[PDB]
Design a protein around this ligand. Structure first.
Ligand code: HEC
Ligand code: HEC
Lengths: 161, 159
């Protein structure tokens, strides 16, 4: 049996995840403000994690099990140049988004993914999102089961032959 | 709570396996196009610290003997996505590492050994002279030769 990494309210809302920084990192991208008219949709660095149980299952199957939790952690750009050269380097943490795959808890949602926003790191739980607010952009464009695995080299290298 | 990374008899670091399941501490990007088409370390960098040393870090805010840090390099795969403009990873390029050991590296700056790797198929690392790597880390890293000003996981996790 595998361990369940998310905790949920009676209404199936994901409680604010603790310890996700010790989950399995799958990739990082950066949409800086200065390259998006000074207001990026999701500022700015994005560090992404999958719970360890679903990583074991992805390692053996290449699919996201029932119970997958993915957390995307946002951080600011801290600087543009360092002794290694020019670019983007992280500053401080900004917030988190999450998505959860569960046919039992979300049978009507596209892919059985529930997308969660979080009003702060202090909040008790996430806020479940409307289909147009998140799932639409992901189904339209993500490379596998509504997860942008074209940007998770850890997942592509870790899936079986 | 045992040591990670394995070593030869000369205590040269064997190529670490499974470091993608260690604790990630931050990512940066130096694209080629912002560095006269040839970044010193192309391009994305994803950095990991071994679980035992992460544990000791949450308690003490210090790197213990036996700390292993892996910097994994990857290419920029694209500059625009539905989330907007920026940089997005592509394929993996290689790895660098550093190991702290007061016993085995007593005459290295901070007792850190620095390891380069010829390719993912190399069986072991190549220990570097202090001029090649430790000089730059010593001059500029925020804490004990590690660029913790770029690892927010480490900064938020110390007591
Ligand atoms: C990254 C994201 C993740 C991480 C897993 C993944 O599917 O990649 C989550 C949990 C999440 N977002 Fe999503 N999102 C988009 C793109 C291109 C990426 C990867 C590249 C990057 O990090 O920049 C995402 C795209 C979009 C998008 C296109 C216009 C929309 C409208 C959204 N995302 C919306 C949402 C959410 C609604 C508030 C939400 C909770 C998300 N995304 C979660
Ligand atoms: C990142 C690095 C790491 C990760 C841990 C850390 O201290 O950040 C390792 C294990 C490593 N490098 Fe080093 N390096 C430099 C900078 C600014 C950063 C963090 C920001 C980023 O990811 O870009 C590093 C700087 C330099 C440098 C300045 C001119 C030189 C000459 C080197 N690094 C050299 C080396 C190595 C010699 C081959 C080597 C094994 C390194 N770095 C390992």
């Amino acid at each position: 049996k595998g361990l369940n990494y998310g905790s949920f309210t009676k209404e199936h809302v994901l409680l604010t995840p603790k310890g996700y920084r010790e989950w399995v990192f799958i990739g990082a991208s950066v949409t800086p403000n200065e390259l998006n008219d000074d207001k990026a949709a999701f500022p700015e660095f994005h560090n992404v994690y999958i719970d360890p149980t679903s990583w074991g299952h992805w390692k053996k199957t290449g699919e996201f099990r029932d119970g997958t939790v993915i957390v995307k952690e946002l951080a600011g750009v801290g600087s543009k140049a360092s002794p290694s050269g020019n670019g983007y380097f992280p500053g401080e943490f900004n917030g988190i988004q999450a998505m959860v795959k569960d046919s039992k808890r979300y049978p009507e949602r596209p892919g059985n993914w529930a997308f969660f926003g979080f009003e702060s790191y202090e909040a008790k739980q996430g806020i479940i999102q409307t289909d147009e607010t998140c799932a639409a952009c992901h189904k339209e464009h993500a490379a596998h089961d509504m997860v942008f695995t074209q940007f998770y080299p850890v997942l592509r290298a870790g899936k079986p032959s």
